[PDB]
Design a protein around this nucleic acid. Structure first.
Ligand SMILES: Nc1ncnc2c1ncn2[C@@H]1O[C@H](COP(=O)(O)OP(=O)(O)NP(=O)(O)O)[C@@H](O)[C@H]1O
Lengths: 706, 40
RNA sequence: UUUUU
């Protein structure tokens, strides 16, 4: 059980301030700053701004939970400036790689001593302010990586990303593995359990952790709902927050008794001076379809078209002559001429950021984007328009939550430019108004820890001499939240008594049986000895952290990757970085299906042993997870082919192919110094040759923000 | 609790600055032309 | 029918 307490220090009519103190520790109030400001600002800070600045000035960890449009970045800038002044190093980590590039750009523009460090790019890695991705930091922490020796602050941006069942575990790994002598700045969206995160930090690395929570937004919002069939918008909620039940009832009665649609609403919006506009849709086909439907309207001025020509010309001049004739460039240029553009994960990554620059400039007045244009990406609009409310998540087909609604709708309203933000919602099919009231009234969500066990975790922690997997299991946020319901498991004294007894008394082995099973598999295969100490076979697997390392190391040791060419080896490795499904299964030649069948046999042999050791794996999804849908594309690309020649052999978007190739280049990089572990020299340089004949014309291109 | 990085370094290769790159200045070139933008 | 190192 954890011994922490909260003090709830008073705040003067602004935000809410609380501090998590470790058990028997007296709350000493924050002393005032003695000296000069570490960073002056052109404006007047708000209450929560000043409180977070004061928390940073006293060398104490602080968490701020507010909106994106509130000014939550100022605190991190102050912390970076003060650590620069005191001759200390800083780390600024971001989940997404593009967000890292934009952050590096905007922080090089201001501090002038910064450095970028991602998997793809590394710029000036000797600085007191390093911008890195979360996985690079975790790799550094697992290795020696004597760069955190002289660091005093670590800044986590978008802390709510620790809610993913797939990639939220490396986040907790990074937080747990950090030293006890560093101070943190966590930035959050509005969450209910802000206090519980500070309690976890206090229990984790013996120090106070403050909490700043506010719901202030500089520009008020006004929400509307547009029923399917009608003319006019029904103001459901306004800048004061009351639900105005009469207009919700009127709209729903219209949709009930009565039950180009987007074109009319966009024309209405653009007639009453509501530019710019963001249209949010959850299918990439719908965005392009709506852009084509709006093609018959013009918004830009004659000079604006010259400006868009001038800004597009250089961005495509960097792209060489052959790629300037690609279909997508000539498809998108007229749309950007008219004043409209699309933004989805199927575009070329250079056109995406060109359109981002154009929208930031102000020459794009109606954007048609997917969900991941609002999460991160630093540009707001005046109006936000939702076309649908249902979305495919990955496992089912589901309604948008209140958290997603708040995230996307908060992009409306620009500080000082407009008086209020306008949000429009479309309802089309039997809204059944139990939902729709929940979306516009509810809180966003609590954040919960997933923290599943991985083989890389166990392999790395068995290599370190003074840390074990049990420690990381015990110190996880999952365990911390599962020790919190003592008041309510013991309080069942008033049948249900048997149940409540069972429930509380039972749990002692939470994710311990799984760990035992994983260890058993590891020592059965040969990665670790019976005495549970790592081997030569398991030190190779520690160098692979992109794909399934067990099966890859099984290939490395069995002798599957030798007697193969470089092209047909890098085509075989494409099965480990591509995870999307396609309509059709291409046909492979014998020299491209033999290695696939040997891959599948090794996968079956792995799965048999993994499932005879009480692990719950079905040997259909394991073999169906490795998808050879791009193996001939990769093989053709590493022969001298053209990008235009090759994005006609499959019905997969170009952006997906580019992403797969970048991931495969990263995996090849790790396979180079995973083969250079067992003294393999004939095989080490084959991966390097495969790396050389990938990155040639357009898949790997200089970033516009870099 | 957390041990020193010296013991972390043993048993694995160090961390290298793979794919080092430098600012080409294209972003500054584009920004140089952005003189009469609606936002500015 | 989105997503991401
Ligand atoms: N208290 C304040 N008063 C006036 N302007 C502010 C205040 N706080 C922040 N700002 C400005 O408003 C901007 C808000 O935009 P924001 O989304 O935070 O940009 P960013 O991506 O976080 N950097 C900040 O970048 C400041 O330029």
């Amino acid at each position: 059980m954890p011994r922490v307490k909260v003090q709830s220090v008073e705040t003067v009519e602004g935000c809410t301030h609380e501090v998590a103190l470790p058990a028997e520790e007296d709350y000493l109030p924050l002393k005032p700053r003695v000296g000069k400001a570490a960073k002056e600002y052109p404006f007047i800070l708000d209450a929560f701004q000043r409180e977070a600045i004061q928390c940073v000035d006293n060398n104490q960890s602080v968490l701020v939970s507010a909106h994106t449009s509130a000014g939550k970045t100022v605190c991190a800038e102050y912390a970076i400036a003060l650590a620069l002044r005191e001759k200390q190093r800083v780390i600024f980590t971001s989940p997404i790689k593009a967000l890292s590039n934009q952050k590096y750009r905007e922080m090089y523009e201001e501090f002038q001593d910064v450095g970028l460090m991602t998997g793809d790019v590394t710029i000036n890695p000797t600085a007191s302010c390093l911008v890195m991705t979360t996985e690079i930091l975790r790799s550094m922490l697992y290795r020696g990586s004597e760069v955190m020796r002289e660091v005093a602050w670590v800044i986590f941006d978008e802390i709510h990303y620790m809610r993913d069942s797939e990639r939220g575990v490396v986040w907790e790994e990074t937080i747990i593995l950090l030293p006890d002598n560093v101070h943190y700045v966590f930035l959050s969206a509005t969450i209910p359990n802000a206090r519980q995160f500070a309690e976890w930090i206090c229990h984790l690395h013996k120090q106070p952790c403050h909490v700043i929570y506010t719901d202030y937004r500089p520009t008020p919002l006004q929400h509307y709902i547009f029923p399917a069939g009608g003319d006019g918008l029904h103001l459901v909620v306004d800048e004061n927050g009351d639900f105005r039940e009469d207009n919700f009832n009127t709209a729903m009665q219209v949709l009930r008794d009565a039950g180009s649609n987007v074109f009319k609403i966009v024309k209405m919006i653009m007639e009453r001076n509501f530019q710019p506009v963001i249209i949010f849709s959850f299918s990439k086909k719908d965005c392009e379809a709506y852009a084509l439907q709006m093609t018959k309207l013009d918004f830009n001025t004659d000079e604006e078209k010259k400006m868009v020509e001038e800004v597009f010309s250089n961005a495509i001049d960097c792209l060489s002559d052959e790629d300037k004739k690609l279909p997508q460039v000539e498809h998108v240029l007229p749309l950007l001429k008219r004043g409209i553009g699309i933004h989805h994960g199927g575009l070329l990554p250079i056109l995406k950021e060109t359109i981002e620059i154009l929208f930031s400039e102000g020459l794009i007045k109606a954007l048609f984007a997917t969900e991941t244009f609002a999460m991160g990406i630093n540009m707001p609009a005046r109006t936000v328009l939702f076309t649908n409310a249902r979305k495919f998540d990955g496992k089912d087909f589901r309604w948008i939550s209140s958290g997603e609604y708040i995230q996307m709708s908060g992009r409306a309203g620009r500080r000082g430019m407009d008086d209020r933000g306008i949000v429009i919602l479309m309802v089309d099919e039997k809204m059944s108004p139990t939902i729709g009231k929940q979306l516009l009234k509810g809180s966003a969500d609590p954040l919960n820890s997933a923290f599943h066990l991985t083989y890389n975790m166990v392999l790395n922690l068995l290599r370190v001499e003074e840390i074990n997997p049990e420690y990381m299991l015990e110190k996880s946020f999952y365990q911390f939240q599962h020790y919190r319901a003592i008041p309510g498991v013991v309080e069942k004294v008033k049948d249900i008594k048997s149940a409540k007894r069972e429930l509380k008394k039972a749990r002692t082995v939470l994710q311990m049986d799984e760990l035992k099973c994983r260890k058993r598999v590891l020592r059965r295969l040969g990665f670790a000895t019976s005495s549970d100490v790592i081997e030569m076979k398991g030190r190779v697997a520690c160098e692979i952290s992109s794909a399934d390392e067990l099966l890859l190391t099984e290939m490395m040791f069995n002798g599957l990757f030798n007697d193969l060419s470089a092209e047909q080896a890098t085509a075989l490795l494409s099965c480990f970085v591509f995870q999307e499904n396609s309509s059709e299964m291409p046909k492979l030649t014998e020299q491209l299906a033999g290695p696939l069948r040997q891959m599948q046999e090794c996968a079956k042999r792995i799965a048999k042993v993994s499932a005879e050791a009480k692990l719950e794996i079905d040997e259909e999804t394991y073999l169906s997870s490795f998808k050879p849908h791009l193996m001939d594309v990769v093989y053709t690309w590493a022969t001298g082919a053209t990008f235009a020649h090759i994005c006609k052999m499959t019905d997969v978007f170009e952006g997906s192919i580019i992403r797969c190739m970048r991931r495969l280049e990263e995996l090849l990089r790790q396979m180079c110094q995973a083969a250079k572990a067992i003294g393999n020299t004939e095989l080490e340089n084959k991966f390097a040759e495969g790396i050389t004949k990938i990155k040639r014309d357009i898949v790997f291109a200089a970033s516009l923000y870099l | 609790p957390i041990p020193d990085m010296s013991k972390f370094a043993t048993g694995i290769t160090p961390f290298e600055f793979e794919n080092m790159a430098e600012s080409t200045g294209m972003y500054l070139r584009i920004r140089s032309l952005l003189k009469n933008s609606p936002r500015n």
